[PDB]
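FYI - complex with PGW, inputs then prediction.
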Amino acid sequence: AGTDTGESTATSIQTWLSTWIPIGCAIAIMVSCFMWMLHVIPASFIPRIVISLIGIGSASYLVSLTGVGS
Amino acid sequence: AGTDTGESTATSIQTWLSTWIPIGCAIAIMVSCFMWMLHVIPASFIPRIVISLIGIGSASYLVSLTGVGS
Amino acid sequence: AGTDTGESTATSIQTWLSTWIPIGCAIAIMVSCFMWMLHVIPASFIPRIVISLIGIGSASYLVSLTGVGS
Amino acid sequence: AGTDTGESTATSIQTWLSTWIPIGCAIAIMVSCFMWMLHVIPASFIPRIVISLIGIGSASYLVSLTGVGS
Amino acid sequence: AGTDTGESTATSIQTWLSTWIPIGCAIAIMVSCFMWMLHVIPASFIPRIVISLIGIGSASYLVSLTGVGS
Amino acid sequence: AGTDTGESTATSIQTWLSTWIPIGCAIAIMVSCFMWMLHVIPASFIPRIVISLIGIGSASYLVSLTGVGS
Amino acid sequence: AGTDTGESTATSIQTWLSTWIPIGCAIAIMVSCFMWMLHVIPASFIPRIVISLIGIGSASYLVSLTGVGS
Amino acid sequence: AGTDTGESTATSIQTWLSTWIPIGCAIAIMVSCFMWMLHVIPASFIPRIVISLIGIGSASYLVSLTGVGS
Amino acid sequence: AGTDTGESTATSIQTWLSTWIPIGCAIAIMVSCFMWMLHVIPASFIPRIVISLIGIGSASYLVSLTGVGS
Amino acid sequence: AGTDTGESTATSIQTWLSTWIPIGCAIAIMVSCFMWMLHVIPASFIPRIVISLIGIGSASYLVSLTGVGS
Amino acid sequence: AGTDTGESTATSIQTWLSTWIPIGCAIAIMVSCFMWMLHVIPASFIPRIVISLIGIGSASYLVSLTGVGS
Amino acid sequence: AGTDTGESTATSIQTWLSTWIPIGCAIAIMVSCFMWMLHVIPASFIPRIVISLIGIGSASYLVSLTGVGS
Amino acid sequence: AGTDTGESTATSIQTWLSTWIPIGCAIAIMVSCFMWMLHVIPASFIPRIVISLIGIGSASYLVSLTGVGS
Amino acid sequence: AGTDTGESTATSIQTWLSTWIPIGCAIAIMVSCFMWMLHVIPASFIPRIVISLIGIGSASYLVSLTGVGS
Ligand SMILES: CCCCCCCC/C=C/CCCCCCCC(=O)O[C@H](COC(=O)CCCCCCCCCCCCCCC)COP(=O)(O)OC[C@@H](O)CO
Ligand SMILES: CCCCCCCC/C=C/CCCCCCCC(=O)O[C@H](COC(=O)CCCCCCCCCCCCCCC)COP(=O)(O)OC[C@@H](O)CO
Ligand SMILES: CCCCCCCC/C=C/CCCCCCCC(=O)O[C@H](COC(=O)CCCCCCCCCCCCCCC)COP(=O)(O)OC[C@@H](O)CO
Ligand SMILES: CCCCCCCC/C=C/CCCCCCCC(=O)O[C@H](COC(=O)CCCCCCCCCCCCCCC)COP(=O)(O)OC[C@@H](O)CO
Ligand SMILES: CCCCCCCC/C=C/CCCCCCCC(=O)O[C@H](COC(=O)CCCCCCCCCCCCCCC)COP(=O)(O)OC[C@@H](O)CO
Ligand SMILES: CCCCCCCC/C=C/CCCCCCCC(=O)O[C@H](COC(=O)CCCCCCCCCCCCCCC)COP(=O)(O)OC[C@@H](O)CO
Ligand SMILES: CCCCCCCC/C=C/CCCCCCCC(=O)O[C@H](COC(=O)CCCCCCCCCCCCCCC)COP(=O)(O)OC[C@@H](O)CO
Ligand SMILES: CCCCCCCC/C=C/CCCCCCCC(=O)O[C@H](COC(=O)CCCCCCCCCCCCCCC)COP(=O)(O)OC[C@@H](O)CO
Ligand SMILES: CCCCCCCC/C=C/CCCCCCCC(=O)O[C@H](COC(=O)CCCCCCCCCCCCCCC)COP(=O)(O)OC[C@@H](O)CO
Ligand SMILES: CCCCCCCC/C=C/CCCCCCCC(=O)O[C@H](COC(=O)CCCCCCCCCCCCCCC)COP(=O)(O)OC[C@@H](O)CO
Ligand SMILES: CCCCCCCC/C=C/CCCCCCCC(=O)O[C@H](COC(=O)CCCCCCCCCCCCCCC)COP(=O)(O)OC[C@@H](O)CO
Ligand SMILES: CCCCCCCC/C=C/CCCCCCCC(=O)O[C@H](COC(=O)CCCCCCCCCCCCCCC)COP(=O)(O)OC[C@@H](O)CO
């Protein structure tokens, strides 16, 4: 009697986040490198950025790799 | 019914930081060289400054190199 | 039938804080430098004071930069 | 309907600290020089004392230099 | 409603230290000369003792020379 | 036909509290400093005491600053 | 119709604490110095004891310095 | 209606500690000298033991020197 | 027409508790020290035990110190 | 009309714990020394074991030393 | 109405650990000597192994030496 | 006129739980050790498992030790 | 009147976990070694993996060793 | 009534990691050698890389060597 807005709403939210999450990732790299130059944080932040970027781009693939939502 | 201020807000914050982050980088180079002259810190700070400057200028390129936000 | 005291009350609170927040900032600089002389805290407090002062003076500009309240 | 004790309280606290902070600074110089004589700490404490004294005496000037509280 | 014990406490601590710090300085000179006789430490300790004694006796003068606490 | 005991009762309660609230504030400062000496609580209690004292003495002024009860 | 036991009760509690708080302060100094000898805690505890003792003896003066309870 | 066990309890605890703290101090001197013989720790432990012993024996005098508990 | 069992009942309950509360206090000291040995809880429990014992033995005196029940 | 099981129950619990708490203390010493050999924890655990053993054996004496339960 | 499994459980755990803790101690000696050959760690590990072995074999004796569990 | 099913029902419930509670205890040990390997929880879970196992096996004995149900 | 699914359900859950817990343990070893290569975590993770593996394989034996569920 | 995705999900995650963990290991060797050339880190990193590579390739074998998951 109505419209199913469950799948569409979830897809719309996913599309919206991808608009500005990538820009926020670039900000963190610039700010983190600045803090490292000032001797505020250790250098163990470099591997974190690469691993986090792997997870962000592989989010959809990882979920289906476990059999959920197929 | 409104305006999307997700991408614009992230871009505005990125533009603002680039106004004064470069000046802060020059301050660190001057202060770090002063501390080295006083025998307070080792000389291993020189490679750090070059590597940090590489990361700051390559932040946007590095993010898209991993496929995020394209 | 009455008076709108929403904008005025918020403005009055903002004006009151600016009277004594700046004096409190000077106290922290003096006390933090004293603790550093005593070998109680590391020197990574110096960049914090500059960054915090940037945020305090740019509070109004930063809010409107994101499109809120215009 | 009352009295504003925001600016006065902050000023009173600042005036009180300046009574005994300078005496504490002289104690640190005497004790630090003693520890250096005993071969307990390195000589990199001498530049710290001068820099800390610069910050303590310039606390008020530095805050207004950034535009806060004017 | 009470008594201010900020300046007095700092002065009392300064007076107490001067009672036994000078005796400790004489002990270091005697022990350091003994170690030098045994070929345990280099002779670069002699200039350190003179410079440390200059700093201990000039602690109060040096603090006010920078404008702090006047 | 009677007496209005609304404003008087509120004023009487306010006057009574001011008799012993200030003494209770001094107790907290003494006890809090004792706990800090014992390594039981962090040093972030010092700014709390100053801010709370500002609020207690400015209670009447703050209420009228928002236009209530004038 | 009764007796006001607000100011008296607060004063009585303050007087009681001053009987045994000073003895507890001496215990902490003795125990803290013992732990330092055993290489369990750093030497940054010495400035804490002096600052805490300043606060304990100045509790009443500090409260009235801000205008509360006068 | 009862007995005040605030001052007595604090005094009893102080008396108990002095029974075995001095013996523990002698153990540390013997063990620390052993570790030094084995080339495990530097010789900067010798000044620490003297300074700690000064603090332990002067705990009561130091507290009253600041005006607390008199 | 009957017997007043208000004061007697309260006194009887107080006497009963004092029979086994002290034994329970000794159990806590033994168990708390065991947990500390196992690195389960911090050492800030030691001051708590002394302060709690002061309160337990001074319960009757503290109540009458405030003027209640005299 | 019944039996008082307040003092007896507390005594029974105390006696039960002393059966196996001492064996648990020996386990901790053996395990802690093993972890130290593996370079997992610092050597500041040795003074903790001695102090904890002092507290466990002196639990009953310490409680009565403060006047509780006599 | 049941069985006391407090002393037995503690004894069983102690017996189990002694089965494989000694083998783990031999592994550490072999691995630590290997790291020393590679110039990765200093030679101050040799005294640690002897002292740790003394503590492991004397765990039960040390506990009863202090009067606990007898 | 009927049958007393009070003691029997309580005994039956106790017997049923002992069938699968022990298996659940083994699951927790396996899962807790897995979480520790992943750096999700601290190592203070090991003493908890031993103490909980002591309580489970001594439930009946502990109840009668206090005189209840005999 | 029904079927007892208490012991069977607990056994079924235990059997299911053992299917994939071992594979998860191998993943942690591979990932932990990778983080160590990157200088992100200390080397004290190696003893943890061995001890955790001992606990996982001995879960059933350890539970019955204490007398629970026999 | 469904599908068991416990073993398969764990296996899939293990297979995915092996795709890019080896490439990350080669990056660390290249970067670590660069830092060594610049006199930033000591040469004790060479044995770490070999030992970490041994652990990564032996993860599955080591787990079953202890009896887990067989
Ligand atoms: C994209 C690729 C980027 C690669 C990374 C950038 C590389 C830039 C060069 C530096 C490292 C060169 C290789 C290592 C040289 C060999 C190692 C060496 O000589 O050791 C020290 C450095 O000396 C040295 O060279 C010292 C001089 C090195 C610097 C050369 C001049 C550069 C400009 C100077 C202003 C800084 C500007 C920083 C931003 C660019 C000794 O010295 P000094 O006895 O003091 O004891 C310091 C301490 O030990 C005190 O405790
Ligand atoms: C898919 C697989 C991904 C794998 C993970 C990514 C790997 C990327 C490389 C980093 C780790 C390399 C292995 C470890 C190197 C050996 C360990 C080492 O050298 O240690 C520090 C790092 O130095 C170093 O190399 C420092 C340089 C390492 C980084 C190399 C250049 C990268 C670009 C730079 C901009 C960042 C962009 C981040 C996003 C990509 C010393 O340094 P620094 O004395 O400062 O004391 C810092 C601190 O100790 C201060 O408290
Ligand atoms: C908008 C952009 C803003 C950018 C952010 C502001 C930047 C302002 C400069 C600071 C960082 C400079 C770069 C880092 C310098 C290289 C790193 C360095 O030298 O390390 C320490 C700092 O030394 C140092 O320079 C110490 C001196 C640095 C400060 C220079 C003088 C400033 C005035 C002083 C009063 C404070 C006023 C704060 C408000 C302005 C060593 O020291 P110290 O052996 O003590 O061991 C401390 C600790 O390790 C003890 O545990
Ligand atoms: C606004 C700008 C401010 C700038 C900052 C202030 C500058 C004030 C001078 C100091 C640094 C000079 C540059 C560095 C000198 C070259 C480096 C040098 O010589 O090294 C050490 C210092 O020696 C030295 O000079 C030692 C002497 C330096 C101090 C000169 C006399 C000053 C008064 C003395 C009382 C202190 C009062 C502090 C408050 C003013 C050797 O020594 P020493 O073998 O002991 O091994 C110590 C350790 O290595 C033991 O582990
Ligand atoms: C209107 C505007 C009001 C503004 C608010 C009031 C401001 C008043 C100053 C305090 C904050 C200063 C800025 C922060 C200083 C930099 C931060 C710093 O040093 O950190 C700690 C504080 O040390 C410190 O300074 C400690 C000293 C700070 C206090 C200075 C003396 C004040 C009098 C003392 C009696 C109390 C009376 C309270 C009522 C007035 C270290 O310490 P401590 O190693 O112990 O580890 C404690 C913990 O971490 C243990 O777990
Ligand atoms: C109230 C005032 C109190 C003032 C404080 C007390 C002062 C008591 C004297 C000590 C410091 C003397 C001044 C410094 C001497 C000059 C500095 C010196 O010689 O350096 C080291 C100490 O040597 C030395 O003297 C070593 C000998 C110094 C001690 C003299 C005999 C004292 C009794 C011995 C039993 C301890 C009892 C401790 C409690 C009293 C070399 O040594 P060693 O090559 O080993 O490398 C150790 C390490 O570097 C290994 O890594
Ligand atoms: C109102 C104003 C008040 C101002 C605040 C009070 C000031 C009172 C002096 C202390 C700080 C002096 C300035 C800092 C000195 C320079 C810094 C310094 O030397 O560092 C440590 C302290 O050494 C030192 O001086 C140690 C000696 C400092 C103390 C001097 C004697 C005081 C009496 C002793 C009994 C305590 C009584 C406490 C209540 C009064 C080294 O040491 P140690 O190798 O052990 O490594 C400890 C750790 O690093 C181990 O992990
Ligand atoms: C009326 C007035 C009463 C005043 C209150 C009573 C005072 C009684 C003394 C305690 C506090 C002393 C001042 C603080 C000391 C300086 C602070 C200090 O050393 O810190 C810890 C305590 O160490 C320490 O001293 C530990 C030893 C302190 C206790 C001294 C022996 C007492 C008897 C022992 C049995 C208990 C009986 C309790 C009932 C009496 C370090 O330790 P540990 O590395 O373990 O890390 C623990 C944790 O951090 C682990 O997460
Ligand atoms: C109950 C009482 C127990 C007492 C404690 C046990 C005592 C057992 C002996 C050791 C300490 C002897 C006293 C100190 C010796 C004088 C100090 C000395 O020589 O210094 C180092 C040790 O050298 C040395 O002796 C090195 C040799 C010392 C060991 C002698 C052979 C022992 C067996 C070997 C297998 C280990 C088995 C461990 C378990 C038993 C130099 O060396 P190396 O240039 O390498 O720079 C290492 C580093 O500096 C690299 O950074
Ligand atoms: C009632 C009064 C009680 C008083 C309290 C008890 C006192 C019992 C002695 C210990 C402290 C002695 C004073 C401090 C010694 C000087 C300080 C010292 O040497 O430092 C460490 C301890 O070394 C050391 O002595 C290590 C040896 C100290 C222990 C001496 C043998 C005791 C038996 C051994 C089995 C344990 C049984 C515990 C229950 C009794 C170095 O070491 P290690 O390079 O490893 O770096 C560890 C870490 O830094 C690694 O991160
Ligand atoms: C009746 C009397 C019962 C008494 C109670 C039972 C006692 C059983 C032993 C444990 C405590 C030993 C005393 C404390 C040891 C000294 C303290 C110590 O070493 O600390 C941690 C534990 O390490 C350690 O020993 C870790 C090893 C301790 C366990 C020894 C092997 C036991 C079997 C293993 C499977 C579990 C089976 C559980 C059921 C029996 C460090 O570790 P790790 O760096 O990981 O940081 C963890 C965390 O800090 C991460 O955030
Ligand atoms: C399964 C069993 C595995 C066993 C573990 C692997 C073993 C692989 C060899 C290394 C250790 C050899 C034993 C120790 C040698 C004796 C000790 C020695 O010489 O000391 C340093 C290392 O020098 C040296 O050899 C330096 C050369 C050692 C390496 C030999 C060539 C290897 C390939 C190179 C690319 C890395 C690839 C890493 C992955 C395979 C001096 O140097 P350098 O003055 O620089 O001061 C560095 C620092 O002190 C600066 O602060």
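Chain A touches chain N at residues 54, 62, 65-67 (CB under 8 Å). The pocket of PGW (ligand 7) is lined by residues C 38-39; D 20, 24, 27-28, 31-32, 35, 40-41; E 9-10; G 29, 33, 42-43, 46-47, 49-50; H 44, 48, 51, 54-55, 62 (CB under 6 Å).
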